[PDB]
Amino acid sequence: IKAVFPCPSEPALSKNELILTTESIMKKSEFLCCQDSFLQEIKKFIKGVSEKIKKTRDKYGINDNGTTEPRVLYQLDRITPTQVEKFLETCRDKYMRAQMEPGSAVGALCAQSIGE
Amino acid sequence: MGTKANLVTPRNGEPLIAAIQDFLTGAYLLTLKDTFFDRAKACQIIASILVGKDEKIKVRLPPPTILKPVTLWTGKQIFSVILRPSDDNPVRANLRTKGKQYCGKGEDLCANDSYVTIQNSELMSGSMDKGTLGSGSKNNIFYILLRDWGQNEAADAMSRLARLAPVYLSNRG
Amino acid sequence: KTALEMVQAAGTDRHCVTFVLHEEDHTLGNSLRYMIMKNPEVEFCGYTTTHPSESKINLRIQTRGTLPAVEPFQRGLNELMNVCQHVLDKFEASIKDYKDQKA
Amino acid sequence: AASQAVEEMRSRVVLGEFGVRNVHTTDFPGNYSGYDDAWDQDRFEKNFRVDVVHMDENSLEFDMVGIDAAIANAFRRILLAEVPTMAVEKVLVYNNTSIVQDEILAHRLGLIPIHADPRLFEYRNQGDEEGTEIDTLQFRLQVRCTRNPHAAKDSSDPNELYVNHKVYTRHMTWIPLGNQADLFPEGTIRPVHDDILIAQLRPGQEIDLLMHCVKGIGKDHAKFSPVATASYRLLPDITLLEPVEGEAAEELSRCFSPGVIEVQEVQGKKVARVANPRLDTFSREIFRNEKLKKVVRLARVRDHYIFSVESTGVLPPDVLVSEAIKVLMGKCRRFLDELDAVQ
Amino acid sequence: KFSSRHGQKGVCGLIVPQEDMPFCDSGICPDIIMNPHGFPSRMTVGKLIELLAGKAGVLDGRFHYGTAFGGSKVKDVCEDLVRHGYNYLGKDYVTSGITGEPLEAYIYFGPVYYQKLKH
Amino acid sequence: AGILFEDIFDVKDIDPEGKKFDRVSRLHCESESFKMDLILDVNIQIYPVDLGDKFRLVIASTLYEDGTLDDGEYNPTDDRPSRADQFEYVMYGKVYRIEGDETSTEAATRLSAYVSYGGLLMRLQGDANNLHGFEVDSRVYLLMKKLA
Amino acid sequence: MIIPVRCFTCGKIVGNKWEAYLGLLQAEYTEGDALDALGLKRYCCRRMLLAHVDLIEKLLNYAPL
Incomplete structure (x- = not known):
């Protein structure tokens, strides 16, 4: 997601904002259908991304408000709001499409899979 | 029951339709650090791709990797045309994986050139081996193409390799 | 009907055109590719045989600018044709000269 | 310097211990920084030279300097496959009683070469089996093997015991059609070799057959190919990087082919010089000797090609090479005519 | 189906015109081209020795013996090739028929007995 | 100008782990003016580099000094005055990873920029103030001239 | 069964050489030297005479005559 849609001219805010944006997107009508365990796993991954951003920002001049002078420093762990919206949708669609289709002949597939 | 819909085994989900033998060796030899090519040799190898529905695509030749003492491209640049043959192709494949032979250190600055990075359908590092182009791996480019861009994009790329890899190896020897 | 010219797109852009040459093989295509790749205007020239079975070569010329x-x-x-005419004349003159020295 | 390195890259293919480097032709516009590679007809004409090293009946050796590999390969490919010749296509068989199968005997007859000149005859149209005086030549072979009436008692040797024991290409007799007899004087149309063994017979066994010969190109069948082998080799240019003197000269002379290296005692001390690099067969045995590997460089001049053509005897070798160049000129003209029709 | 007498059996995938086949300096073009990939998994070193022995034997005019537990050694056969002007290892410098330019790698070229199978 | 970075570099090692390739050598270098270490692959067939050589390395966003970023396609045949006329070796590649120094837990300023020239990699490592103007997915010209 | 008229790879006519080769072998000439006298320089041509088995003579002993 970061490479396919690298967003220049975007806020690139992080830490508290990342977790706030994620929780708002998770609770938007969709994602209720998603199994609850999956939603928790996304939150654990997002919490990890937020922790990584904080450590890097502390190590190399924390953004006072997004105004630090070497602007290359902002590229160190860059997640922008459009990327967060794309990541959460791609994960919902990938999960929904991974569900076994009803009528899958589940038993026949297992017997062949054990034999090979 | 179509091949495009069944490119992955039901047992683990690993890809089963993938490059084998001489397709794999032509690609490893093309994508080695020493493979460098002049405009004519580049144009001929890329030309093999333009058949069977690729006739109606205008080929994009990437700018040459070497430019001043002599103008030269790299094999990694020519392999990348298999992934995005034209400027109107929408596939922007991304992979970052250890190749077999990985030194264990320096992720992408390995001594053996065995860490693969593909950005926007362009190989930036590494040589293609069974791990990235062959069966049995979920770190395959064809698998990332199936999962992220679709069955058709993966199948088109596999057909392009079966045309490019034989033409380089027959002429190289 | 030996030569059929297929334009790259519906727009019929002249700069990229594929010439399909019937009853042809690597002998004409490789020699022509060298002659037409010595033109500064041609950005990309390559020939591909669609299948070993069919005797046709598809030659794609992509020009640098507006050339058709x-x-x-x-x-x-x-x-x-000019390179062939010169070689034939030079070869014949050399062969005649060799026979004369032998005589 | 770097300029020296580029000059070798564009002019010499260097043979190495594990591989051949600088293989590709790189002289195209824009491939180099200080060199103009755009086509100049005047430059090509001045540089090109053809030298006939050796010509003997059925063999021609010549050197083309300044030609490119793609143009040179075309001449070799045209000579092998696109220069037309006359060969047996249909064998009508009456009373074949020999051990050899008729299908095998038909194939052997097709392979035998005919001395008829292809340019005079014309291609037979599809079907049209009967043929015409212009498009075909008819040869009749009738041989019957009989016991020799006056023979020695032991008769261990078949040749003494039997007459016409072996069918040879001399037996084949041309049957003239229409005005062909006047156009071709007796003996102009004959099988070239005269000694090829078509079949072997025993007493009471007879082969009677009629053969029709048609013009064809090598691409359709190998029987129509006019050259035993046509091949080109780039000229060898061995260079000794460091002066080599002493017993080393004797080993360096041994590593290469018999006449390429001549050892001369300039001051009573052996010194090695390269006299005839053309003879080198590139066995690359110098690489086996560790000391001499670094003292010599094995390379081939890219634009000098030594071409060897051996004919099957159907037509003189010089004529075959001239015909091949004309066939390429024809292929270009056919396409130019199509472009005129399109626009 | 054609087999090589070393347990490697193949079907004829393609029939190519002589002009497209790669040619060595002598002008010999290969009757059969065999993929190098077969030898590493199969571990048929004997076939590689048989090409070298046959090439040396044809040039010498002698028939070499590959009898089990004995046979012609590689060292003796290589010396015969050097006398006849060929590389001891039997790898020959070839040029490509399709492109007209030399192949980057030296190609092993030699005579090997092939038997046509009934199928 | 369109210059991103410019310094004089001294070659310190040629092959750390042996000669893995023929044409390519892995040059490890260090700069005089700034404390910059440089990993660079160069084609040592066309351009030969020795263990003591000193060279000037400019990285530029555009090859025409008038600051016109117009690069629809690069035409080798076209001849106009440019920056490459002053330099011996030129490569075109893409900046693909900016990464922080891991070797200090606090108060750090070293950054790594990675550029890939079709597979010939460069790591440029130094103070963040000198690597300014690098961005991911940007395309840069390396230029290089040896000094007597 | 009978000597092939043309070498399989090169295409040289080798049908004419069989009778001479047998005669040279009948004399003291060595197999390599006999092939050299016939002019079969390339290895492809040499194998055809060297590896040929003449079964036509043996088969004919059983032919009707």
């Missing part, structure tokens, strides 16, 4: 691509292809055929 028929003009580079035609110039290449003319150059190959």
